[PDB]
mmCIF file of N, CA and C in Angstrom:
data_model
loop_
_atom_site.group_PDB
_atom_site.id
_atom_site.type_symbol
_atom_site.label_atom_id
_atom_site.label_comp_id
_atom_site.label_asym_id
_atom_site.label_seq_id
_atom_site.Cartn_x
_atom_site.Cartn_y
_atom_site.Cartn_z
ATOM 1 N N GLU A 1 -15.948 164.304 -10.080
ATOM 2 C CA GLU A 1 -15.224 163.016 -9.933
ATOM 3 C C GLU A 1 -15.863 161.930 -10.834
ATOM 4 N N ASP A 2 -15.130 161.540 -11.885
ATOM 5 C CA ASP A 2 -15.504 160.443 -12.801
ATOM 6 C C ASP A 2 -14.469 159.327 -12.656
ATOM 7 N N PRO A 3 -14.865 158.025 -12.787
ATOM 8 C CA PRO A 3 -13.906 156.887 -12.763
ATOM 9 C C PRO A 3 -12.993 156.819 -14.016
ATOM 10 N N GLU A 4 -12.998 157.872 -14.851
ATOM 11 C CA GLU A 4 -12.057 158.028 -15.970
ATOM 12 C C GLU A 4 -10.837 158.860 -15.540
ATOM 13 N N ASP A 5 -11.022 159.716 -14.510
ATOM 14 C CA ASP A 5 -9.925 160.502 -13.902
ATOM 15 C C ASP A 5 -8.888 159.557 -13.254
ATOM 16 N N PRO A 6 -7.543 159.823 -13.439
ATOM 17 C CA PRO A 6 -6.452 158.898 -13.025
ATOM 18 C C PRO A 6 -6.513 158.508 -11.537
ATOM 19 N N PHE A 7 -6.596 159.520 -10.644
ATOM 20 C CA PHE A 7 -6.658 159.300 -9.186
ATOM 21 C C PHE A 7 -7.959 158.589 -8.766
ATOM 22 N N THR A 8 -9.080 158.899 -9.446
ATOM 23 C CA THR A 8 -10.403 158.354 -9.082
ATOM 24 C C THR A 8 -10.466 156.834 -9.341
ATOM 25 N N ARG A 9 -10.017 156.421 -10.544
ATOM 26 C CA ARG A 9 -10.019 155.001 -10.988
ATOM 27 C C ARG A 9 -8.914 154.192 -10.295
ATOM 28 N N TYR A 10 -7.837 154.894 -9.898
ATOM 29 C CA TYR A 10 -6.752 154.347 -9.059
ATOM 30 C C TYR A 10 -7.305 153.970 -7.675
ATOM 31 N N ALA A 11 -8.013 154.933 -7.063
ATOM 32 C CA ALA A 11 -8.662 154.770 -5.755
ATOM 33 C C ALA A 11 -9.774 153.705 -5.833
ATOM 34 N N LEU A 12 -10.470 153.674 -6.987
ATOM 35 C CA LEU A 12 -11.539 152.703 -7.276
ATOM 36 C C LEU A 12 -10.950 151.298 -7.473
ATOM 37 N N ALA A 13 -9.742 151.236 -8.056
ATOM 38 C CA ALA A 13 -9.000 149.981 -8.247
ATOM 39 C C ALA A 13 -8.604 149.392 -6.894
ATOM 40 N N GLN A 14 -8.228 150.278 -5.952
ATOM 41 C CA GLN A 14 -7.964 149.895 -4.561
ATOM 42 C C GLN A 14 -9.244 149.318 -3.917
ATOM 43 N N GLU A 15 -10.417 149.896 -4.261
ATOM 44 C CA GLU A 15 -11.727 149.404 -3.774
ATOM 45 C C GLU A 15 -12.052 148.009 -4.357
ATOM 46 N N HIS A 16 -11.718 147.792 -5.651
ATOM 47 C CA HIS A 16 -11.866 146.476 -6.321
ATOM 48 C C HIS A 16 -10.998 145.406 -5.624
ATOM 49 N N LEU A 17 -9.777 145.798 -5.200
ATOM 50 C CA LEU A 17 -8.878 144.932 -4.400
ATOM 51 C C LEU A 17 -9.569 144.502 -3.092
ATOM 52 N N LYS A 18 -10.223 145.480 -2.443
ATOM 53 C CA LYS A 18 -10.919 145.301 -1.156
ATOM 54 C C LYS A 18 -12.183 144.428 -1.311
ATOM 55 N N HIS A 19 -12.810 144.473 -2.507
ATOM 56 C CA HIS A 19 -13.982 143.629 -2.843
ATOM 57 C C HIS A 19 -13.571 142.268 -3.441
ATOM 58 N N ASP A 20 -12.251 141.954 -3.400
ATOM 59 C CA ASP A 20 -11.670 140.676 -3.893
ATOM 60 C C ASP A 20 -11.734 140.573 -5.452
ATOM 61 N N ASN A 21 -12.162 141.671 -6.117
ATOM 62 C CA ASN A 21 -12.156 141.811 -7.591
ATOM 63 C C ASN A 21 -10.785 142.347 -8.051
ATOM 64 N N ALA A 22 -9.737 141.614 -7.647
ATOM 65 C CA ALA A 22 -8.337 141.929 -7.958
ATOM 66 C C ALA A 22 -8.094 141.940 -9.475
ATOM 67 N N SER A 23 -8.819 141.063 -10.194
ATOM 68 C CA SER A 23 -8.806 140.989 -11.665
ATOM 69 C C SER A 23 -9.262 142.311 -12.323
ATOM 70 N N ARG A 24 -10.319 142.932 -11.761
ATOM 71 C CA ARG A 24 -10.878 144.193 -12.288
ATOM 72 C C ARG A 24 -9.931 145.365 -11.968
ATOM 73 N N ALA A 25 -9.331 145.302 -10.767
ATOM 74 C CA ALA A 25 -8.326 146.274 -10.298
ATOM 75 C C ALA A 25 -7.051 146.195 -11.149
ATOM 76 N N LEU A 26 -6.731 144.962 -11.585
ATOM 77 C CA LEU A 26 -5.539 144.656 -12.386
ATOM 78 C C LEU A 26 -5.627 145.384 -13.722
ATOM 79 N N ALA A 27 -6.767 145.192 -14.407
ATOM 80 C CA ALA A 27 -7.076 145.855 -15.682
ATOM 81 C C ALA A 27 -7.011 147.394 -15.568
ATOM 82 N N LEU A 28 -7.546 147.944 -14.452
ATOM 83 C CA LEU A 28 -7.518 149.401 -14.176
ATOM 84 C C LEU A 28 -6.080 149.946 -14.112
ATOM 85 N N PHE A 29 -5.221 149.282 -13.319
ATOM 86 C CA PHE A 29 -3.827 149.705 -13.120
ATOM 87 C C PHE A 29 -2.997 149.526 -14.416
ATOM 88 N N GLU A 30 -3.178 148.391 -15.110
ATOM 89 C CA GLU A 30 -2.499 148.110 -16.398
ATOM 90 C C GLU A 30 -2.861 149.155 -17.474
ATOM 91 N N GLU A 31 -4.132 149.616 -17.474
ATOM 92 C CA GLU A 31 -4.569 150.669 -18.400
ATOM 93 C C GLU A 31 -3.944 152.010 -18.002
ATOM 94 N N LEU A 32 -3.894 152.269 -16.684
ATOM 95 C CA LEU A 32 -3.295 153.486 -16.111
ATOM 96 C C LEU A 32 -1.833 153.660 -16.556
ATOM 97 N N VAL A 33 -1.096 152.543 -16.693
ATOM 98 C CA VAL A 33 0.281 152.554 -17.219
ATOM 99 C C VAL A 33 0.300 152.956 -18.705
ATOM 100 N N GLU A 34 -0.437 152.194 -19.545
ATOM 101 C CA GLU A 34 -0.386 152.354 -21.018
ATOM 102 C C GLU A 34 -0.890 153.740 -21.478
ATOM 103 N N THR A 35 -1.891 154.300 -20.769
ATOM 104 C CA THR A 35 -2.480 155.603 -21.102
ATOM 105 C C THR A 35 -1.698 156.747 -20.435
ATOM 106 N N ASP A 36 -1.321 156.559 -19.155
ATOM 107 C CA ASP A 36 -0.655 157.601 -18.333
ATOM 108 C C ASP A 36 0.634 157.019 -17.730
ATOM 109 N N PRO A 37 1.749 156.909 -18.528
ATOM 110 C CA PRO A 37 3.027 156.362 -18.020
ATOM 111 C C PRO A 37 3.664 157.285 -16.966
ATOM 112 N N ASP A 38 3.172 158.532 -16.918
ATOM 113 C CA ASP A 38 3.580 159.552 -15.954
ATOM 114 C C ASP A 38 3.129 159.201 -14.523
ATOM 115 N N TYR A 39 1.897 158.649 -14.378
ATOM 116 C CA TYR A 39 1.294 158.401 -13.053
ATOM 117 C C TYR A 39 2.054 157.286 -12.309
ATOM 118 N N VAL A 40 2.942 157.729 -11.406
ATOM 119 C CA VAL A 40 3.866 156.866 -10.660
ATOM 120 C C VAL A 40 3.101 155.985 -9.643
ATOM 121 N N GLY A 41 1.993 156.555 -9.102
ATOM 122 C CA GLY A 41 1.178 155.896 -8.076
ATOM 123 C C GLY A 41 0.612 154.548 -8.510
ATOM 124 N N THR A 42 0.343 154.419 -9.820
ATOM 125 C CA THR A 42 -0.087 153.162 -10.430
ATOM 126 C C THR A 42 0.949 152.046 -10.229
ATOM 127 N N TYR A 43 2.210 152.339 -10.605
ATOM 128 C CA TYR A 43 3.283 151.332 -10.747
ATOM 129 C C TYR A 43 3.526 150.532 -9.462
ATOM 130 N N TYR A 44 3.557 151.245 -8.329
ATOM 131 C CA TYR A 44 3.642 150.633 -6.998
ATOM 132 C C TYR A 44 2.511 149.605 -6.787
ATOM 133 N N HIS A 45 1.264 150.095 -6.838
ATOM 134 C CA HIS A 45 0.052 149.304 -6.514
ATOM 135 C C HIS A 45 -0.197 148.150 -7.512
ATOM 136 N N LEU A 46 0.204 148.344 -8.779
ATOM 137 C CA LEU A 46 0.075 147.317 -9.829
ATOM 138 C C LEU A 46 1.092 146.202 -9.596
ATOM 139 N N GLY A 47 2.313 146.592 -9.193
ATOM 140 C CA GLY A 47 3.372 145.636 -8.918
ATOM 141 C C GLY A 47 3.078 144.810 -7.677
ATOM 142 N N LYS A 48 2.484 145.457 -6.647
ATOM 143 C CA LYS A 48 2.092 144.780 -5.396
ATOM 144 C C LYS A 48 1.031 143.710 -5.705
ATOM 145 N N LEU A 49 0.097 144.074 -6.599
ATOM 146 C CA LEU A 49 -0.979 143.188 -7.059
ATOM 147 C C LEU A 49 -0.415 142.010 -7.884
ATOM 148 N N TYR A 50 0.597 142.297 -8.719
ATOM 149 C CA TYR A 50 1.332 141.269 -9.475
ATOM 150 C C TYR A 50 1.960 140.226 -8.530
ATOM 151 N N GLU A 51 2.628 140.695 -7.462
ATOM 152 C CA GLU A 51 3.262 139.815 -6.451
ATOM 153 C C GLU A 51 2.227 138.861 -5.810
ATOM 154 N N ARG A 52 0.999 139.377 -5.595
ATOM 155 C CA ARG A 52 -0.136 138.596 -5.054
ATOM 156 C C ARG A 52 -0.514 137.449 -6.008
ATOM 157 N N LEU A 53 -0.504 137.762 -7.315
ATOM 158 C CA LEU A 53 -0.918 136.835 -8.387
ATOM 159 C C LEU A 53 0.248 135.941 -8.875
ATOM 160 N N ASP A 54 1.371 135.912 -8.106
ATOM 161 C CA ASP A 54 2.608 135.151 -8.448
ATOM 162 C C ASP A 54 3.258 135.642 -9.765
ATOM 163 N N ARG A 55 2.878 136.854 -10.180
ATOM 164 C CA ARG A 55 3.413 137.539 -11.368
ATOM 165 C C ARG A 55 4.560 138.472 -10.936
ATOM 166 N N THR A 56 5.463 137.924 -10.114
ATOM 167 C CA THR A 56 6.565 138.664 -9.482
ATOM 168 C C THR A 56 7.529 139.278 -10.523
ATOM 169 N N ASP A 57 7.730 138.580 -11.656
ATOM 170 C CA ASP A 57 8.590 139.072 -12.756
ATOM 171 C C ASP A 57 7.978 140.328 -13.406
ATOM 172 N N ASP A 58 6.652 140.285 -13.584
ATOM 173 C CA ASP A 58 5.864 141.393 -14.151
ATOM 174 C C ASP A 58 5.920 142.599 -13.206
ATOM 175 N N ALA A 59 5.931 142.302 -11.887
ATOM 176 C CA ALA A 59 6.064 143.306 -10.825
ATOM 177 C C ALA A 59 7.397 144.055 -10.947
ATOM 178 N N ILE A 60 8.500 143.291 -11.128
ATOM 179 C CA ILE A 60 9.872 143.838 -11.299
ATOM 180 C C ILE A 60 9.921 144.848 -12.463
ATOM 181 N N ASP A 61 9.253 144.475 -13.571
ATOM 182 C CA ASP A 61 9.176 145.293 -14.797
ATOM 183 C C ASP A 61 8.416 146.612 -14.522
ATOM 184 N N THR A 62 7.274 146.490 -13.814
ATOM 185 C CA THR A 62 6.386 147.617 -13.477
ATOM 186 C C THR A 62 7.065 148.612 -12.520
ATOM 187 N N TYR A 63 7.808 148.078 -11.541
ATOM 188 C CA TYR A 63 8.565 148.891 -10.581
ATOM 189 C C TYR A 63 9.696 149.641 -11.283
ATOM 190 N N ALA A 64 10.399 148.948 -12.201
ATOM 191 C CA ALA A 64 11.490 149.525 -13.010
ATOM 192 C C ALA A 64 11.004 150.708 -13.871
ATOM 193 N N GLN A 65 9.826 150.537 -14.502
ATOM 194 C CA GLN A 65 9.149 151.615 -15.251
ATOM 195 C C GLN A 65 8.781 152.771 -14.303
ATOM 196 N N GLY A 66 8.317 152.388 -13.103
ATOM 197 C CA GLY A 66 7.983 153.328 -12.046
ATOM 198 C C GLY A 66 9.169 154.165 -11.600
ATOM 199 N N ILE A 67 10.341 153.524 -11.480
ATOM 200 C CA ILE A 67 11.600 154.159 -11.038
ATOM 201 C C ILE A 67 11.977 155.338 -11.947
ATOM 202 N N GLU A 68 11.874 155.117 -13.270
ATOM 203 C CA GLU A 68 12.217 156.121 -14.298
ATOM 204 C C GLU A 68 11.360 157.384 -14.137
ATOM 205 N N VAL A 69 10.049 157.167 -13.970
ATOM 206 C CA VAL A 69 9.073 158.259 -13.845
ATOM 207 C C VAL A 69 9.031 158.824 -12.410
ATOM 208 N N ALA A 70 9.517 158.056 -11.422
ATOM 209 C CA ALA A 70 9.555 158.489 -10.007
ATOM 210 C C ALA A 70 10.654 159.533 -9.765
ATOM 211 N N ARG A 71 11.862 159.239 -10.270
ATOM 212 C CA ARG A 71 13.036 160.113 -10.089
ATOM 213 C C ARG A 71 12.897 161.424 -10.884
ATOM 214 N N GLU A 72 12.276 161.364 -12.075
ATOM 215 C CA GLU A 72 12.108 162.557 -12.930
ATOM 216 C C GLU A 72 10.786 163.306 -12.629
ATOM 217 N N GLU A 73 9.651 162.578 -12.692
ATOM 218 C CA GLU A 73 8.290 163.178 -12.627
ATOM 219 C C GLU A 73 7.725 163.201 -11.192
ATOM 220 N N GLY A 74 7.916 162.091 -10.457
ATOM 221 C CA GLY A 74 7.406 161.946 -9.085
ATOM 222 C C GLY A 74 8.319 162.616 -8.060
ATOM 223 N N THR A 75 8.357 162.087 -6.832
ATOM 224 C CA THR A 75 9.322 162.526 -5.795
ATOM 225 C C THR A 75 10.232 161.367 -5.354
ATOM 226 N N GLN A 76 11.205 161.687 -4.468
ATOM 227 C CA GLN A 76 12.109 160.699 -3.844
ATOM 228 C C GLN A 76 11.314 159.647 -3.039
ATOM 229 N N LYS A 77 10.151 160.067 -2.501
ATOM 230 C CA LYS A 77 9.202 159.176 -1.808
ATOM 231 C C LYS A 77 8.803 157.988 -2.710
ATOM 232 N N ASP A 78 8.390 158.317 -3.946
ATOM 233 C CA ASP A 78 7.960 157.326 -4.947
ATOM 234 C C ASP A 78 9.136 156.427 -5.326
ATOM 235 N N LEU A 79 10.286 157.079 -5.594
ATOM 236 C CA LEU A 79 11.504 156.419 -6.082
ATOM 237 C C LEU A 79 11.963 155.317 -5.117
ATOM 238 N N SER A 80 12.082 155.681 -3.832
ATOM 239 C CA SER A 80 12.556 154.784 -2.772
ATOM 240 C C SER A 80 11.616 153.576 -2.592
ATOM 241 N N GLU A 81 10.286 153.818 -2.662
ATOM 242 C CA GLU A 81 9.262 152.758 -2.499
ATOM 243 C C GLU A 81 9.296 151.729 -3.641
ATOM 244 N N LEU A 82 9.504 152.204 -4.869
ATOM 245 C CA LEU A 82 9.519 151.348 -6.077
ATOM 246 C C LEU A 82 10.799 150.506 -6.160
ATOM 247 N N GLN A 83 11.929 151.126 -5.779
ATOM 248 C CA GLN A 83 13.233 150.447 -5.684
ATOM 249 C C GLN A 83 13.201 149.401 -4.557
ATOM 250 N N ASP A 84 12.491 149.741 -3.460
ATOM 251 C CA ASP A 84 12.326 148.860 -2.290
ATOM 252 C C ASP A 84 11.427 147.660 -2.624
ATOM 253 N N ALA A 85 10.316 147.945 -3.296
ATOM 254 C CA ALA A 85 9.288 146.952 -3.584
ATOM 255 C C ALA A 85 9.785 145.904 -4.589
ATOM 256 N N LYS A 86 10.619 146.337 -5.554
ATOM 257 C CA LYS A 86 11.259 145.397 -6.486
ATOM 258 C C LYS A 86 12.366 144.586 -5.809
ATOM 259 N N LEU A 87 13.191 145.191 -4.901
ATOM 260 C CA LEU A 87 14.348 144.462 -4.317
ATOM 261 C C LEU A 87 13.893 143.287 -3.444
ATOM 262 N N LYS A 88 12.721 143.422 -2.784
ATOM 263 C CA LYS A 88 12.107 142.296 -2.042
ATOM 264 C C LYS A 88 11.500 141.267 -3.016
ATOM 265 N N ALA A 89 10.908 141.751 -4.132
ATOM 266 C CA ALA A 89 10.355 140.880 -5.186
ATOM 267 C C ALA A 89 11.451 140.018 -5.870
ATOM 268 N N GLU A 90 12.684 140.574 -5.972
ATOM 269 C CA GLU A 90 13.893 139.849 -6.452
ATOM 270 C C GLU A 90 14.126 138.547 -5.626
ATOM 271 N N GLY A 91 13.709 138.590 -4.340
ATOM 272 C CA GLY A 91 13.919 137.500 -3.386
ATOM 273 C C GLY A 91 12.690 136.630 -3.134
ATOM 274 N N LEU A 92 11.538 136.958 -3.764
ATOM 275 C CA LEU A 92 10.307 136.134 -3.661
ATOM 276 C C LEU A 92 10.517 134.792 -4.376
ATOM 277 N N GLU A 93 10.647 134.874 -5.707
ATOM 278 C CA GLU A 93 10.880 133.712 -6.574
ATOM 279 C C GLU A 93 12.344 133.256 -6.503
ATOM 280 N N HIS A 94 13.250 134.202 -6.133
ATOM 281 C CA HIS A 94 14.718 133.965 -6.055
ATOM 282 C C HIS A 94 15.269 133.497 -7.435
ATOM 283 N N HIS A 95 14.524 133.842 -8.495
ATOM 284 C CA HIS A 95 14.835 133.502 -9.891
ATOM 285 C C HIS A 95 14.944 134.810 -10.695
ATOM 286 N N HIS A 96 15.253 135.908 -9.983
ATOM 287 C CA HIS A 96 15.339 137.244 -10.582
ATOM 288 C C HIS A 96 16.511 137.313 -11.577
ATOM 289 N N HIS A 97 16.358 138.148 -12.599
ATOM 290 C CA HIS A 97 17.344 138.292 -13.689
ATOM 291 C C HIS A 97 17.975 139.691 -13.655
ATOM 292 N N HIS A 98 19.018 139.882 -14.475
ATOM 293 C CA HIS A 98 19.805 141.124 -14.496
ATOM 294 C C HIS A 98 19.159 142.153 -15.445
ATOM 295 N N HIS A 99 18.472 143.148 -14.864
ATOM 296 C CA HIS A 99 17.907 144.282 -15.613
ATOM 297 C C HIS A 99 18.938 145.435 -15.632
#
């Protein structure tokens, strides 16, 4: 187990969230997207973190990317959660746009 492995650094990013180092967790999840666009588990947790930081628009984008890889690469479990997490984010700022 190295913090370079996708699941390990993902789980470690969750630990950074718990230590209030949300900024360090943010960088981990954002890198997880750019390097491993396949890893659906990132997109959920990164978007949730975006909503915390009032980056709700960025969250919508991350969930949408997640949806594509959830339906093809992930499972229906992933797909439903990402579609759900964005539809509530559409109503946070209530300034959501047509994707």
